[PDB]
Structure formats: structure tokens, C-alpha cells
Design a protein around this ligand. Structure first.
Ligand SMILES: OC[C@H]1O[C@@H](O[C@H]2[C@H](O)[C@H](O)[C@H](O)O[C@@H]2CO)[C@@H](O)[C@@H](O)[C@@H]1O
Ligand SMILES: *[C@@H]1O[C@H](CO)[C@@H](O)[C@H](O)[C@H]1NC(C)=O
Ligand SMILES: *[C@@H]1O[C@H](CO)[C@@H](O)[C@H](O)[C@H]1NC(C)=O
Ligand SMILES: *[C@@H]1O[C@H](CO)[C@@H](O)[C@H](O)[C@H]1NC(C)=O
Ligand SMILES: *[C@@H]1O[C@H](CO)[C@@H](O)[C@H](O)[C@H]1NC(C)=O
Length: 344
């Protein structure tokens, strides 16, 4: 069966089945130009038992790239352009076509907080201000909402969308936490006005929560208040990410991070998604306990490791980083096949 993804209780209902899910992050799937490479990668994710894939819904530039290169939007002070050609959103159309064929669902964010594939910084280059005034910059928000409409209107009636996501890891360094509350409230209401079929979520890391141990990720220096954000009526579930190597914490501290976020989602009456995580050293040893904590904590609806790695018919490998779990490797057995077997 194929239906729209909804919430039943504090769990997700995916194609009629209510219960915990495992998924993965594949940002780079959206920029593949050979259809055979999207089909082999999605065949491997589906046969491993994963049900949800997170892909980028953006690729922002200030100058058009070399001919043949993918770009979704060019941001300029004298008129921006949204690319719907073969080197533009037609690459994302194939990803949604392949998810429909393979019975997979997709989480799709509209902008990056960081400068990879343009981000907030590509809007600042075109419309001025800086990375914290971006949220209230009228020319930047007018173009961001025109790009949201261009992506949402393509797939609004497709059953392969798990959720729309306002951005990857939005932050407002040193800002009052109300700047992201008011922006996320207005933009999620706009997404719901374009599409009443699909769930909407923020895409934040989960920073700012007072029931923890006081380490930096629980404090309020990045402009976000997790409990305030998940109470917004037009956000349907909470997201949180986990990277002890970048945040100055040890790996076992991650279990309490999952438990505190789960409890804050369940207090707001909604599921949480453990949407990104990784350990640079010994990932099988250090990330397996996190997957067991998430599966056995009330308030959790599913988890998605960062990130899938795969290889193609011509012998090329995908994009990758030190957190890649390569399909069919010993870390795939440990963190993918053994975890799907424990879920069901
Ligand atoms: O959290 C993963 C993101 O980390 C970012 O770097 C942060 C780091 O998390 C921490 O908050 C430190 O205090 O500031 C760093 C730099 O601004 C980036 O590396 C980003 O790419 C990651 O996705
Ligand atoms: C960003 O611009 C705002 C408004 O002028 C300013 O108050 C803030 O200090 C600036 N950020 C940086 C890092 O300069
Ligand atoms: C598409 O979905 C919208 C709700 O977002 C609904 O109003 C519309 O009727 C659907 N289109 C078709 C052709 O069913
Ligand atoms: C690591 O951190 C926690 C506190 O955040 C501490 O209680 C624990 O003993 C430490 N564990 C290891 C294995 O270092
Ligand atoms: C994956 O490993 C199995 C052996 O367990 C093998 O049959 C299959 O060819 C492999 N897939 C790829 C893409 O190599």
C-alpha cells in the first residue's frame, strides 16, 4: 500500500503500519545525474529494511556553475532564478519517482544553515545583512518562500513525502530564542497553506533544553529553545541530532541526550525523530547503545544515522565523510541489518 504519512498516537503510520522506523541520511542522492545510480542506491536502502531517507531539497549558488553542473536556485540582487531544467529540479523529480517505486518516504529540507550547497550565506551575498538578520530580511525571506513554493508544489500530492523540513540545522548564534520561534511559526503556516497532506518539522539539532546536565548543547547560545519550538502548532514532530566529537562531550553522554529530548516531545504530545547521529571513532561500539536507547524510550518515533555510503555500476563511489556507513560493510551489519532485526 501507499498512503500519506500521518501520526497515530505518538507513533508514525507509514503505508498503514503504525510503529517505530529506521531510516538514513543521503544528502547527495538529490544531486545524482545518472538515474541508474539513484535506483541502485534506493534498491539497497529498501532491501536493508529502512523506510525513510533524508535528502537535500536545496542547491543554492550566486553564479551559475560550469555547464552540466547541477543547481536548483541562483540568488542575485537583480533577480533570482529557480532552475526547473534537466540540470536543476528534474534531478530531485527522479529521486521522488524512485522513492515511489521502492516504497520509501523522504524528509526534504529547503535551505542549509551552513554554507555547503550555498546556505543562508548565499542569501546574505545576494540580499545583504548577516547570518542572524537573515530570518527577518524581507528580500531574503521573499525569495526563500518563492523557492519553498516551487519545491512543495511539485510533490504536494505524492505519497512519497514523509515531511517538509524548514532547514538543515537552523541556528541564530547569540540571538533571542524568539527569532526562530516566530520565523518557524510563520514559515510552517505557509507550508501548510500550500499542502494539507504532509507533515512539517523544523530540522534543528535540538540545542537548548533545561532538563540536561548543563553541557554546551543544552545551553541557549545558538538561538534555539527545543521545548518552545516543539509546542508550535504547525510543526507535527520534533527533530534532534547528535555529534559528541564536534560538541566536546563523550559518547555515553548521548544516551541522556536522547532521553531528555524524547521526554520533551512526549510532554508536547508529539513524536520525536532522532534525525542525525555519528561517532568518528569505533562507530559499531559507540553508536549501537544509542540505537537501543532510542528504540526503547517512550516519545521516540524513529532514528536515521548520518550517513549512507554506496557505490555505482561504473565503479565510482558516492560522496562520503568520516561518519559514512558503507552498504554491505561490517558497520552496515552492525548498525543497519542488526538494528532493523531488533525493531522487527
Ligand atoms: O553539529 C554538527 C554541525 O557542527 C557545526 O560546527 C559547530 C559545532 O557543532 C559546535 O556548535 C561549535 O560550537 O560550533 C561549530 C562551528 O560553528 C558545523 O561543523 C556543521 O557543518 C555541522 O553540521
Ligand atoms: C549582525 O547584524 C546585526 C544587526 O546589525 C548585528 O546587531 C549583529 O551584531 C551582527 N553580527 C555580527 C557577527 O557581526
Ligand atoms: C492535492 O492535495 C490538495 C491538498 O494539499 C487537495 O486540495 C487537492 O484536491 C489534491 N489534488 C488532487 C487532484 O487530488
Ligand atoms: C562521561 O561523561 C559522563 C558525564 O557527562 C560521566 O558521568 C561518565 O563517567 C563519563 N563516561 C566515560 C566512559 O567517559
Ligand atoms: C552484497 O553482499 C551480498 C553477499 O552477502 C552479495 O550477494 C551482493 O552482490 C552484494 N551487493 C553489492 C552491491 O555488492
Amino acid at each position: 500500500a501507499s498512503s500519506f504519512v500521518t501520526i497515530s498516537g505518538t507513533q508514525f503510520n507509514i503505508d498503514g503500519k503504525v510503529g517505530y522506523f529506521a531510516g538514513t541520511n543521503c544528502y547527495w542522492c538529490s544531486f545524482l545525474t545518472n538515474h541508474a545510480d539513484v535506483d541502485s542506491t534506493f534498491s539497497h536502502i529498501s532491501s536493508s529494511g529502512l523506510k525513510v531517507v533524508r535528502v537535500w531539497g536545496f542547491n543554492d549558488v550566486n553564479t551559475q556553475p560550469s555547464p552540466g553542473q547541477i543547481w536548483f536556485q541562483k540568488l542575485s540582487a537583480t533577480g533570482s532564478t529557480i532552475n526547473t531544467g534537466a540540470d536543476g529540479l528534474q534531478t530531485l523529480d527522479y529521486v521522488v519517482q524512485s522513492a515511489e517505486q521502492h516504497n520509501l518516504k523522504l524528509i526534504i529540507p529547503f535551505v542549509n544553515n551552513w554554507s555547503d550547497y550555498g546556505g543562508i550565506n548565499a542569501y546574505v551575498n545576494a540580499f545583504g545583512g548577516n547570518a542572524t538578520t537573515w530570518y527577518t530580511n524581507t528580500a531574503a525571506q521573499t525569495q526563500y518562500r518563492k523557492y519553498v513554493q516551487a519545491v512543495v508544489s511539485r510533490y504536494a500530492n505524492s505519497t512519497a513525502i514523509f515531511a517538509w523540513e524548514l532547514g538543515n540545522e537552523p541556528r541564530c548564534n547569540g540571538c533571542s530564542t524568539d527569532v526562530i520561534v516566530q520565523w518557524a511559526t510563520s514559515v510552517s503556516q505557509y507550508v501548510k497553506s500550500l499542502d494539507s497532506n504532509h507533515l512539517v518539522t523544523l530540522g534543528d539539532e535540538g540545542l537548548g533544553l533545561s532538563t540536561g546536565d548543563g553541557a554546551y548543547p543544552y545551553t541557549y547560545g545558538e538561538g534555539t529553545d527545543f521545548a518552545k519550538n516543539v509546542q508550535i502548532k504547525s510543526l507535527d514532530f520534533g527533530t534532534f541530532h547528535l555529534y559528541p566529537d564536534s560538541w566536546g562531550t563523550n559518547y555515553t553522554w548521548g544516551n541522556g541526550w536522547i532521553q531528555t529530548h524524547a521526554a520533551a516531545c512526549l510532554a508536547a504530545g508529539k513524536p520525536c525523530v532522532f534525525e542525525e547521529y555519528g561517532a568518528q571513532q569505533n562507530p559499531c561500539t559507540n553508536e549501537a547503545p544509542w540505537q537501543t536507547t532510542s528504540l526503547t524510550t517512550r516519545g521516540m518515533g524513529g532514528d536515521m544515522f548520518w550517513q549512507w555510503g554506496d557505490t555505482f555500476a561504473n565503479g565510482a563511489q558516492s560522496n562520503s565523510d568520516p561518519y559514512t556507513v558503507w552498504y554491505n560493510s561490517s558497520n552496515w551489519q552492525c548498525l543497519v541489518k542488526n538494528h532493523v532485526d531488533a525493531i522487527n
